[PDB]
Amino acid sequence: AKILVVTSGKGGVGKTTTSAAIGTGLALRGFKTVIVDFDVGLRNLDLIMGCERRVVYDFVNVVNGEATLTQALIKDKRLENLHVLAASQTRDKDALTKEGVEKVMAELRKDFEYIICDSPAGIEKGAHLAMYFADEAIVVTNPEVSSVRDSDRMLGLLASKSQRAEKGEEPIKEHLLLTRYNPERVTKGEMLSVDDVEEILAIRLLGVIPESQAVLKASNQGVPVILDEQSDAGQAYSDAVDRLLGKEIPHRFL
């Protein structure tokens, strides 16, 4: 019912990590969720969802009609509310039409509660189709001068190039999320603080996720990091999903 896209503009900020984390966090809460890997030809989401060996059909098959949406969705083993529509490696991002992705968004919206769209990097056509049919958007930002500038270009593209911008509905509800935030390096002054990003971008923070070795360990064993509750980042990911559902929480780990 609610299509929210994880986007950034600047590559490598952690979109897939956040997409898998928030996609699992909303399935633990109980909502029947799907995550759509939109990085066609350069797939990455099924690798850190631990779903890479079960993939038979992918995102570009459903568009071209070589399989159905029930044939391509991968039910998880640990969660029953979580499904993943992984992408291909052969065909690149021109093999996704705006019309073909519209059909998949329609019948995904009938069955599921939350649709998480792991956008690829940049401001090009693969990053535009993830943006397009979205209702909300989480913008991922590193606390650094480049990633705030290039995440600012993105918030202006979730206000003009959307579908709710060309059809005149209410605009996309935007959310900011600082990833791989190093609290020790913001006191040395070589990173932006949590309030400089809240001032330059001038929106409400969904949360601040610290630098963690648990993030690389979790993707190395196939699990999202919100299913690792002993660490600091897994806590910080599991509060940002509550802040998605209105429940205001004071930020920690800073």
Binding site: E52, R53, R54, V55, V56, Q89, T90
Partner: protein
């Protein structure tokens, strides 16, 4: 009429032996797909998708020196990497064949 691929078949690549066999003498990186309507011989470490006998032939075969495929499929009957790890001969010299309607995994 037996197409030989002597280079590394990197991820995202697809090789299509249109007439008959396909011999791959290098490593096939994960994400690559090798499809041929005859047999497929992989004499390197295969980590991609082997699709043998693609145009309707239940007598095609797949031979790998190291079974690490993401998917093997003869004439349509596939077998993903999830249940191939469960059997033995994972990472072993393997010989895939279609007996009627099920895939076999020999050593």
């Amino acid at each position: 009429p037996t197409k030989v691929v002597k280079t590394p078949v990197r991820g995202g690549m697809q090789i299509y032996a249109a007439g008959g066999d396909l011999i791959v003498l290098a490593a096939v990186s994960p994400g690559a797909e090798l499809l041929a309507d005859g047999n497929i011989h992989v004499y390197g470490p295969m980590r991609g998708r082997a699709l043998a006998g693609v145009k309707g032939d239940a007598t095609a075969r797949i031979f790998c020196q190291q079974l690490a495929a993401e998917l093997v499929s003869i004439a349509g009957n596939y077998k993903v990497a999830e249940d191939l790890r469960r059997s033995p001969q994972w990472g072993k010299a393997v010989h895939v064949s279609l007996s009627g309607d099920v895939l076999n995994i020999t050593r």
